Design a protein around this ligand. Structure first.
Ligand SMILES: [Zn+2]
Ligand SMILES: [Zn+2]
Lengths: 449, 452
């Protein structure tokens, strides 16, 4: 098996069980997994390829736990730039009706490229529209070319505007079709073993877009098949009122009532989750995908992340779809989580290591994976390296780790995913990025005009 | 004098009085000023050099209205990353006591380089510590090397621990020395003419950091000499309580009491300004430097920027010192101003164009300048260009202007300051940037390992 040695990192951040931060640290990789982590004599190890990381910080690859990568074709749509969750959706649904399988394939690559160059090695997605013959398969095809570790969610909507829901009737599907497609996707694509590069989750989009019947059946199938469940929960005030008006419950009560609690569940946003819901999630092991830029750009609110963490809730990080961020920058999202918790809850609400922990270990937890998220023997060989001698970080070498969260670094210098060196000296190796960006912009023009 | 044609920008954002956004726009420059703004008809203009901006957006240069560039040597100090503001100041003051003139010279260039590469063409600074023979002259020297348009503030502190303050016995100066140095700096450096590359302002660190007498003479000297006044005001709950307890008035009332209102005054932060203070600033023309990343990173609060703007207060943008941000990224700070206003006050509190106006015209206004901040005939030739065909902006060409605020672009592709092309295809031209960064980190190492 192919061996790879990364040697002489200025700081090697492990996020391991001792949270070791090794000066001069070295990483030895074999195949897709880590052999050993340390300094000293391990740096003298021969290997099939050695890469010198002097002047760089190495961290575990960041883990993105919420996205809508198809929306990277529709950033800053003029009619959608100003306004809240509902109304924003109302202006964007008509544009998304034009999506083709090619747009799904290319936009998965574009969004994934932006995430990979900003430090991310594992991401989920939440594709929930399937017009014009689009399939989750098209997104999987693109994810396979670019080499990122992928948790593909079969998103869905069934309750159109005629039935008391939000999406237009054209963009929703029949619930039996959804369940059959979900089962097909699991059987064809879900790899449940260690170091898997592709897993499937089931993800009805939100309580205002799907029936409770589909929520229960989806959960039943996921438990039967051994896969996770994902949805939007308590994103803003309208979300909370809709659930109170239509179902007589808080979003947390509604989730538990449907079986959507447990370590195989993770909810996006949870901005308006109440103290009772936080305790419920803590005791059931239910996960949260925190999306701070989205929560700001849509004026959703400040999620009570510090309160969730203090009760033992599992919190990961997500950029959300690029029509509500509108960036796809993972390390910048980690910075935002620190800044927003501090402005919301005080100077002790979130430091650099706590935010980075959410962005790594927290993401592994909410995706229900124990093989990513930190660097130790037997873990997946997923990590990135930032050049510390850039202008962006000048004067911040007093703490190379905090520098990534308190400053605004550029792209990663190196990225390793599943043992593959996918980024080399700032250059994405697995696709022709200028060509994909070029195609992406042509398709985006086609989609909107 | 040298002439320059920038042609065929995908979108040329002028921020002029009609807020023209010109498809295919062109800019004709002579010396330090804009000769014409228009479309392809400008391509028949002769020029010493043509620069093709196809695929790029051009905007007016961003204007930074608050900084402490010396702190770029002391980012993420472990003792100061977390904790309360008392611990922030108390742990950083002893380190800044080691600052040398060379450190001031170099860190000005480092901080200005980060600002310039992120879209900024004019900045103020607020140097308020002068140990070991450091002088505002040293930062002026570094700014002249890099070519940025510069509003250098003679910051000051006089109230040390002996008089109930925080800084050590000294970072604080004798109050007569401060004024004599202030007058010297004005006489030696302040250039009051149009297109000036250097202006001086007087900037006690806060109204509580100097005697009431010093606040008053300083304002008197500034008015006599025709220069502006700058300070920290109403940054947090402690400032409001101190001034209400100790002086019996709100910070804005105390500012009015000292003569620190007027169009030649701009106050940093103003996070905790009340409705009455907002009205006072609106009618006196007093400016605000809004610093969103610092206000979050130090847990100060959300400044009521939308309320200030609705009342007619002049608001600019600032990154603040690099120990309280800790980035020096101007376009990211413009994004943050939008994001933070929306989460504080709702989806109508700030759009991309309103945020970009604050970052350009708003900064020009609070610096009391009518020759920068937008692109029109006779305005200073200060503008930057971002490549629209990058990964970062992929799928955002539906609105090239909003893309700069809603996405996270990389460095500018081109920057022109006072007619000089200071950045060319992403490369800073006026200094050897890798060498300056090397010196900067070496000096930062020396500074933190000093005996104290
Ligand atoms: Zn979402
Ligand atoms: Zn300041």
């Amino acid at each position: 098996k192919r061996t790879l040695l990364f040697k002489n990192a200025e700081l090697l951040v492990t996020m391991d069980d001792e949270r070791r931060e090794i000066r001069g640290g070295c990483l030895l990789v074999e195949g897709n997994r880590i052999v050993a982590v340390g300094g000293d004599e391990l740096c003298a190890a021969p290997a099939d390829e050695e890469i010198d990381l002097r002047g760089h910080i190495v961290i575990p690859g960041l883990i993105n736990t919420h996205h809508h990568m198809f929306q990277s074709l529709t950033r800053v749509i003029p009619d959608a730039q100003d306004g809240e969750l509902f109304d924003w959706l109302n202006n964007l649904y008509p544009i998304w009706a034009g999506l083709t399988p090619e747009m799904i394939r290319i936009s998965t690559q574009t969004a994934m490229a932006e995430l990979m160059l900003s430090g991310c090695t594992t991401s989920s997605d939440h594709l929930y529209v399937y017009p014009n013959g689009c399939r989750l398969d098209d997104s999987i095809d693109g994810a396979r070319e670019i080499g990122m570790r992928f948790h593909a969610c079969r998103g869905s909507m069934s309750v159109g505007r005629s039935k008391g829901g939000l999406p237009p009737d054209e963009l929703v599907e029949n619930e039996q079709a959804i369940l059959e497609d979900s089962l097909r996707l699991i059987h064809s694509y879900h790899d449940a073993q260690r170091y898997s590069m592709l897993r499937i989750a089931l993800a009805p989009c939100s309580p205002f877009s799907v029936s409770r019947e589909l929520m229960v059946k989806t959960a039943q199938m996921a438990r039967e098949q051994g896969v996770s469940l994902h949805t939007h929960l308590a994103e803003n005030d309208s979300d909370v009122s809709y659930s109170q008006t239509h179902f007589g419950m808080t979003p947390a009560q509604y989730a538990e009532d449907l079986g959507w609690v447990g370590s195989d569940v993770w909810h996006a946003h949870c901005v308006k989750l109440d103290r009772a819901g936080i305790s419920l999630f803590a005791r059931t092991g239910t996960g949260v995908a925190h999306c701070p830029c989205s929560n700001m750009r849509l004026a959703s609110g400040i999620a009570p992340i510090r309160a969730m963490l203090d009760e033992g809730v599992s919190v990961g990080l997500g950029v959300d779809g690029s029509a509500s961020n509108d960036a796809g920058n993972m390390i910048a999202e980690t910075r935002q989580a620190m800044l927003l918790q501090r402005v919301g809850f005080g100077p002790d609400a979130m430091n650099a290591r706590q935010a980075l922990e959410i962005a790594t270990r927290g993401g592994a937890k909410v995706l229900n994976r124990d093989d990513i998220g930190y660097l130790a023997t037997g873990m997946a060989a997923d990590f990135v390296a930032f050049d510390l001698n850039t202008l962006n970080l000048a004067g911040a070498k007093h703490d190379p780790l905090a520098a990534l969260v308190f400053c605004t670094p550029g792209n990663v210098a190196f990225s390793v995913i599943n043992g593959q060196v996918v980024i080399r000296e700032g250059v994405l190796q697995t696709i022709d990025l200028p060509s994909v960006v070029q195609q992406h912009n042509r398709l985006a023009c086609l989609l909107v005009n």
